[PDB]
């Protein structure tokens, strides 16, 4: 069923991570267009899956472009969302819907969630409470906000915290504090 | 202090509601530019108060334009946010920051919140747990989402629920289900 599709998709990415990782760097459009992502795509709401894809494809390019920010967990998490024909938008998505267990569950873009839980202690990925396998690894977070880097902890110098939908009029190169999740304020920078 | 400013601003709107209500309908730009809203504006983050204002001014015009949707509570709640020079944006704000009690507290755009609590049973407004006075009243919600009307309860006909940041590519006149708050899905329509 839908839960199996989600677990199986992440299991497949892990099993083939050697090849997938290279393709993500060298020919990502070919990777995104692989048939193996179609079952996952069936779980993503039709009204939004193209915008999710444009978002994730842009995040991935940020990661390619900003040295030292490669994050295996983040690539694996987001990769199936890149598989729709992309459309651009100005929105920041904090989570991404998948239809599973008879409801829309939401995968958090930053860090762990009940759907996608990578255990830094055991090194295994758990999807909806089930094992998906072991991740084989290769401060700035380049694949969370479109057009921004998360650069560290809160700095009071930069004023009141903004929500992720309050960033559109910041200047290129401007730093701001952002409420990125419950009780977690981070410093971001709008990319030049 | 800042808490007093918030309570006093809402008390003032209520005390002068007779005049304010007429001006809101007949000469809203004059109303928005009144000096009495400056102390409230000092509480709104400088980086976002113009965008909050463009949002609220647009919501108010929706209410003027859609017959039978006048909502005294909603006008009073949002009015001080209209007092900044407005700037337009495509964002949907679910809550609006005010700096009070040494933190950024958030006034929910739809319905009640700890900061702004209108009691439908007693008919009084409570701001940060203190009385602000009695509201004197004059299904569609026209002043919550920019470019949309909330039109009723969830209708499964219209598919998976979308978050408020997932609405930008809906067509004019299209209906969708929206997760407007925790465990509350509503049907919306994108205005023609």
Residue numbers in the entry:
A (entry chain A), B (entry chain A): 541 to 678, 685 to 738
From the paper:
Point mutations in the polymerase basic protein 2 (PB2) of the heterotrimeric viral polymerase and their structural consequences have been linked to host-species specificity and virulence factors in humans. Specific C-terminal domain mutations in the PB2 component of the viral polymerase heterotrimer have been associated with different levels of human virulence, giving structural characterization of this protein a potentially important role in the prevention of future influenza pandemics. In this communication, we introduce the Protein Maker and describe its use in purifying five C-terminal domain subunits of the polymerase basic protein 2 (PB2) from two different subtypes of influenza virus.
Initial success with H5N1 and H1N1 CPB2 proteins informed the design and cloning of genes arising from two other influenza subtypes: H3N2, which was responsible for the 1968 and 1969 Hong Kong flu epidemics, and H7N7, a subtype with wide zoonotic transmissibility and potential for high pathogenicity. H3N2 is already an increasingly dominant subtype in the annual flu season in North America and is also endemic among livestock pigs in southern China. Since pigs can be co-infected with multiple zoonotic influenza A virus subtypes, H3N2 in swine has the potential to emerge in a more virulent form with transmissibility into human populations through genetic reassortment. In one run of the Protein Maker, five channels were used to purify five different CPB2 constructs in parallel with other pipeline proteins using our standard SSGCID protocol (see §2). All five constructs were successfully purified from cell lysates (see §2), generating highly pure protein for crystallization testing using sparse-matrix screens. Three of the five purified CPB2 proteins yielded crystals (not shown) and a 1.3 Å resolution structure was generated from one of them by X-ray diffraction. Although previous purifications of CPB2 from H5N1 and H1N1 yielded crystals for 204-residue and 222-residue variants, the only protein which provided well diffracting crystals in this effort was a construct consisting of 216 amino acids. Despite the high sequence identity (>95%) across all constructs, including three previously crystallized CPB2 proteins, only one (InvaB.07055.c.D17) of the five tested led to rapid growth of crystals that diffracted to sufficiently high resolution for structure solution and refinement. In such a scenario, construct design may have been limited to residue lengths which previously worked for CBP2 from H1N1 and H5N1, constructs which to date have not generated crystals for H3N2. Thus, we eliminated the 80% chance of failure (or the fivefold increase in bench time) associated with serial processing of five targets for one successful outcome via parallel purification on the Protein Maker.
